[PDB]
Amino acid sequence: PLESQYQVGPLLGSGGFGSVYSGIRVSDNLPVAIKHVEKDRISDWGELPNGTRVPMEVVLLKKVSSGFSGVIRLLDWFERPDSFVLILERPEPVQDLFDFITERGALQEELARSFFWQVLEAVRHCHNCGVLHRDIKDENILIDLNRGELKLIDFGSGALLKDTVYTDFDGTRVYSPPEWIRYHRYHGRSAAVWSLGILLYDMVCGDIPFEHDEEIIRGQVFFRQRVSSECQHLIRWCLALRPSDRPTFEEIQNHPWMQDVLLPQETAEIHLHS
Numbered sequence: 001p002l003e004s005q006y007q008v009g010p011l012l013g014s015g016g017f018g019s020v021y022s023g024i025r026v027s028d029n030l031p032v033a034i035k036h037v038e039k040d041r042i043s044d045w046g047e048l049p050n051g052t053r054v055p056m057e058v059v060l061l062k063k064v065s066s067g068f069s070g071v072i073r074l075l076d077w078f079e080r081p082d083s084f085v086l087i088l089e090r091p092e093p094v095q096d097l098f099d100f101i102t103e104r105g106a107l108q109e110e111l112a113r114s115f116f117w118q119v120l121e122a123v124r125h126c127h128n129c130g131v132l133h134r135d136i137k138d139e140n141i142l143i144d145l146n147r148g149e150l151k152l153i154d155f156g157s158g159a160l161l162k163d164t165v166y167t168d169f170d171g172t173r174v175y176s177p178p179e180w181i182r183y184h185r186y187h188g189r190s191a192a193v194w195s196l197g198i199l200l201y202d203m204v205c206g207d208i209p210f211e212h213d214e215e216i217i218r219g220q221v222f223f224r225q226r227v228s229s230e231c232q233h234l235i236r237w238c239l240a241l242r243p244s245d246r247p248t249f250e251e252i253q254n255h256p257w258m259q260d261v262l263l264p265q266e267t268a269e270i271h272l273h274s
């Protein structure tokens with residue numbers, strides 16, 4: 001088979017996640033993203049039913065890639081002596097929610113609402129498939145700027161969803177809940193709902209609410225921009241210091257602020273086109 005059925009293009013980015021490149025599938029000019037993960041930097045390993053020892057991201061993406069969904073799909077993967085190479089779907093034109101907020105600042109509530117709903121729909125899909133992302137943030141959300149469809153990326157800090165406590169967090173500290181900071185213990189859904197509150201505030205305020213551990217432990221949110229009282233209410237609910245006091249994905253989606261959402265194409269025509 002060999003790994004030269006893809007044509008390598010510009011390096012999209014690099015970090016602890018490895019290196020991501022823009023690619024093209026030679027067989028049908030399909031756009032793809034190629035991620036190279038060094039074997040040494042793999043924290044949590046997984047195993048495929050056939051016995052192959054692989055990165056956990058491959059396990060979790062195979063559980064959620066039975067599309068369609070708001071999750072970037074794993075098309076293929078390869079093993080090399082000192083690395084693993086993942087072939088993922090690449091929307092085009094595409095923009096990162098982090099870069100989108102860097103350019104446009106605080107998003108209008110109608111846009112934040114459409115974007116936030118699609119994340120909820122995507123996260124619910126991962127949970128329905130027994131996968132937990134565990135690093136929900138603007139940097140891990142791509143926008144298909146023509147279709148106005150958002151898609152989740154980077155399951156490298158994810159895990160299989162479980163009803164017991166997690167005592168491992170390899171995600172963004174400023175997006176981590178107070179219970180992780182204090183006890184180094186959290187539960188999947190409530191820790192996902194905290195991060196969703198950090199995300200919605202980031203959308204509507206143009207920045208995360210907390211920079212340091214004390215601000216997190218305190219969990220008191222100051223609104224720097226004009227934001228509706230219903231939106232502030234949902235944010236503060238998602239950011240309840242006690243996990244049990246946070247909403248469920250159903251309660252978030254049934255909140256008065258989450259009503260009369262736009263469809264992806266309407267959002268792109270009103271807010272993204274031109």
Ligand SMILES: N[C@@H]1CCCC[C@H]1Nc1ccn2ncc(-c3ccc4ccccc4c3)c2n1
Pocket residue numbers: 012013014017020032033035072088089090091094096139140142153154155
């Ligand atoms: N969060 C960054 C946004 C801009 C490009 C580099 C990104 N860093 C990462 C980190 C880990 N992963 N894991 C998968 C991706 C990924 C997947 C598909 C992509 C499609 C188009 C553009 C970037 C893409 C990034 C990724 N990007």
